[PDB]
Design a protein around this ligand. Structure first.
Ligand SMILES: O=P(O)(O)O[C@H]1[C@H](OP(=O)(O)O)[C@@H](OP(=O)(O)O)[C@H](OP(=O)(O)O)[C@@H](OP(=O)(O)O)[C@H]1OP(=O)(O)O
Lengths: 56, 49, 49, 106, 56, 56, 56
């Protein structure tokens, strides 16, 4: 009735980023702003993959 | 197979026969058949991707 | 021969059309053959247990 | 008592609305599809029921009694050739189900 | 006012030195411009595009 | 270069689009709401240039 | 009041991250490159009455 379990979940692929970006919506949240726009990479002393390759 | 690939194209690899369920051989050793393609080919796929 | 210029967009113009319209999920791509084994025979005893 | 086919179409409108609403909520639950298709085959509107079984096989293609009911509708309604197509597609997609092969060779 | 109402000048109204308050409310506008442009943009986008029910 | 226009041009445009109730200007109703998202920036550029009590 | 204004100045001087050299955007040069904006020269009071009527 009203109080009931699920037994099937919702399937993704039909909203906001799923097929055509909801047909290119001009709606965007505060959490979707540019933030941390630069990937850090491992340096020579950190564990760069060149340093990790020769090691036994 | 044509009644299995109705809405698919001609490049799609579907499996529809008994001879897809048969186990292959032990494939003795470091064979050039089961090898990851090439390092530069992998880098080219990476660049395109 | 055709010269294509792209129409110049108004900066001050809101989105034009309703996008929130919602329709049910279409059919999935044609079913793949299931390729199982012959199937283990089931007993009355284990079916009841 | 229903008279001429305006009222018959009103009956059909009510029944189709009820079944399509049960399909909307349950979504899966294969019996809902079977009841609606049996109701469509009872009124000899079997193209509707072809649509319903094809939608139900889109939902769940591995459910073997659904293939069985669809093929037995097409056999029962003297559509030898549709049913024969269905059996060919059934034994192609679910080949280890022996039910399908027995009924098609029978 | 304490610098303005110093000597013979009393505690009347008579003081227009709006440079300071003017700067304070323009520096407010400097930061409220992006916030209100985003908020009004999503307002207009929901009015003209429509609301996405279970999209996000 | 795009040059200056006579100052009576924007005056008559603003005056003919009075409160946007004429049926003749019903195609520009959509653009004014679109321009709503840039009103805070127009307010900022307006009040930034307030004329300085020694100026008439 | 002097203590609080000192507090505001010290919080300015502390959290001064350097200007963070970006790519310049020039919004109004992008508006007047289009075919929808003209440019003129008006009295400030006429523009303020325009901006108020437009916001209304
Ligand atoms: O009632 P007081 O404690 O003496 O303070 C008032 C008050 O200023 P404060 O808000 O700083 O208390 C008045 O402003 P409001 O009461 O309207 O907020 C202000 O006059 P303005 O209304 O013009 O700001 C007035 O200044 P003045 O008395 O010089 O006219 C000033 O009194 P003091 O100047 O003696 O502090």
């Amino acid at each position: 009735t009203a109080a009931r379990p699920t037994f099937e979940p919702a399937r993704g692929g039909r909203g906001k980023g799923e097929g055509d970006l909801s047909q290119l919506s001009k709606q965007y949240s505060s959490r979707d702003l540019p933030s941390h726009t630069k990937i850090k990479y491992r340096q020579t002393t950190q564990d760069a993959p060149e340093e990790v390759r020769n090691r036994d | 197979d044509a009644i299995a690939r109705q809405g698919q194209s001609k490049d799609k690899v579907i499996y529809s026969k008994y001879t897809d369920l048969v186990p292959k051989e032990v494939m003795n050793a470091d064979d050039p058949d089961l090898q990851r393609p090439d390092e530069e080919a992998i880098k080219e796929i990476t660049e395109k991707t | 021969v055709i010269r294509m210029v792209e129409m110049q967009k108004d900066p001050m113009e809101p989105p034009r059309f309703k996008i929130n319209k919602k329709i049910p999920r279409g059919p999935p791509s044609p079913p793949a053959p299931v390729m199982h084994s012959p199937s283990r025979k089931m007993t009355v005893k284990e079916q009841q247990e | 008592k229903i008279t001429d086919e305006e009222e018959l179409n009103d009956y059909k409108l009510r029944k189709r609305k009820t079944f399509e609403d049960n399909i909307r909520k349950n979504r899966t639950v294969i019996s809902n599809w079977i009841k609606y298709a049996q109701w469509e085959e009872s009124l000899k509107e079997i193209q509707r029921a072809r649509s319903i079984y094809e939608r139900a096989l889109d939902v769940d293609y591995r459910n073997i009694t659904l293939w069985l009911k669809y093929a037995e509708m097409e056999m029962k309604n003297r559509q030898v050739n549709h049913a024969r197509n269905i059996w060919d597609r059934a034994i192609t997609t679910l080949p280890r189900v022996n039910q399908f092969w027995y009924k098609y060779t029978y | 006012y304490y610098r303005f109402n110093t000597g013979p000048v009393g505690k009347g109204p008579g003081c227009g030195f709006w440079a300071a308050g003017w700067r304070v409310w323009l520096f407010f506008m400097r930061g409220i411009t992006p916030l209100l442009e985003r908020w009004l943009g999503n307002l207009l986008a929901r009015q003209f595009e429509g609301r996405h029910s279970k999209g996000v | 270069q795009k040059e200056d226009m006579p100052p009576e041009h924007v005056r008559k445009i603003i005056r003919d689009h009075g409160d946007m109730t004429n049926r003749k200007f019903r195609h520009d109703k959509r653009v004014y709401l679109g321009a709503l998202k840039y009103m805070p920036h127009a307010v900022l550029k307006l009040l930034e240039n307030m004329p300085m009590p020694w100026e008439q | 009041s002097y203590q609080k204004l000192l507090k505001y100045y010290v919080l300015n001087a502390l959290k001064h991250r350097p200007p963070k050299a970006q790519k310049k955007r020039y919004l109004f040069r992008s508006f007047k490159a289009t075919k929808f904006f003209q440019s003129t020269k008006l009295d400030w009071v006429e523009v303020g009455l325009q901006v108020c009527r437009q916001g209304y």
